Ligand binder design. Structure first.
Ligand SMILES: [Cl-]
Ligand SMILES: [Cl-]
Ligand SMILES: [Cl-]
Length: 304
């Protein structure tokens, strides 16, 4: 059988982890003995910094990075890092499924990267070893971020110190107190046990963590059309599965964290939320020329 490799950086019991495993199941059911899919979770094969290079080198055939991690290939996907751009996951999905959103799947083709679909995780929440109620509380704290200039600007706007690090290192950096805080979805905070060493989480919903499932032109073109159709259908169905898992994990993992008693969740008043928005919104003007103001206008419009 022709081997297909799918590599990602998350734990198995997560929306992306389950997506990849479902994709394996469906492909192997439909094309038995023709294609086998080997899934490599937890950065076992490639991690944040080298996965896209590996993809284009055809050392791996599918990856699904955070939309934050594509700056080397397009400046447009930085849109998804803008603070308080999307109110909630309904707006995210409306944007992603619109013409404007769908066009972004093709934003990197001229560089060899084929966009196959969006996959959800969830809204991001701040955590630290001290309460984060107003933006002033972030002053002087070190936060790990995904490798994104927008996210660096986000934390610089509140006089915090952002450090770009691969996802596989975050637990250890929190454990050793090399950083004070981070931002992530409930699913990652829970599945990677960040909550065990973060006494405070704020339900800030201040950005989105979603993915684009991608492959290389090299691999995609190499498939016979009829097999590609089956593989694409299998991928799409796996994505829908992953999205259902993503939605479920928001509530389930938030609850599990609260039940553990290891972390105290803070909820923001409208005026507290407004203070974060006002502190961080200026980041957008920094990036708007490269992202595209019209693209930003489309994203804002998805909130209606
Ligand atoms: Cl994870
Ligand atoms: Cl990693
Ligand atoms: Cl999609």
């Amino acid at each position: 059988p022709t081997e297909i490799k799918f590599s990602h950086v998350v734990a198995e019991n997560t929306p992306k982890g389950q997506m990849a495993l479902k994709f394996k199941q469906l492909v192997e059911e439909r094309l038995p003995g023709e294609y086998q899919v080997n899934v490599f979770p937890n950065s076992q094969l490639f991690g944040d910094n080298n996965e896209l290079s590996a993809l284009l080198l055809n050392d791996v055939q599918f990856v699904a990075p955070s939309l934050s991690k594509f700056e080397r290939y397009t400046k447009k996907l930085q849109l998804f890092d803008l603070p308080f751009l999307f109110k909630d996951m309904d707006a995210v999905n409306r944007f992603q499924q619109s013409d404007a959103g769908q066009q972004l799947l093709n934003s990197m083709k001229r560089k060899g990267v084929v966009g196959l679909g969006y996959l959800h995780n969830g809204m991001k929440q701040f955590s630290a070893s001290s309460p984060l109620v107003l933006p002033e509380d972030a002053q002087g704290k070190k936060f790990r971020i995904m490798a994104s200039d927008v996210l660096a600007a986000q934390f610089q706007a509140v006089e915090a110190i952002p450090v770009k690090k691969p996802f596989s290192e975050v637990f250890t950096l929190l454990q050793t107190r090399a950083i004070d805080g981070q931002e992530n979805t409930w699913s990652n905070i829970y599945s990677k046990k960040f909550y065990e060493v973060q006494s405070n989480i704020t339900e800030s919903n201040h950005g989105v963590l979603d993915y684009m499932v991608v492959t290389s032109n090299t691999f995609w073109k190499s498939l016979p059309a009829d097999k590609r159709k089956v593989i694409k259908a299998s991928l799409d169905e796996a994505i829908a599965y992953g999205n259902e898992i993503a939605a479920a994990k928001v509530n389930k993992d938030k609850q599990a964290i609260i039940d553990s008693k290891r972390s105290e969740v803070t909820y923001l008043t409208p005026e507290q939320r407004a203070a974060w928005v006002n502190a961080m919104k200026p980041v957008w003007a920094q990036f708007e020329d490269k992202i595209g103001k019209d693209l930003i206008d489309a994203a804002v419009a998805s909130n209606e």
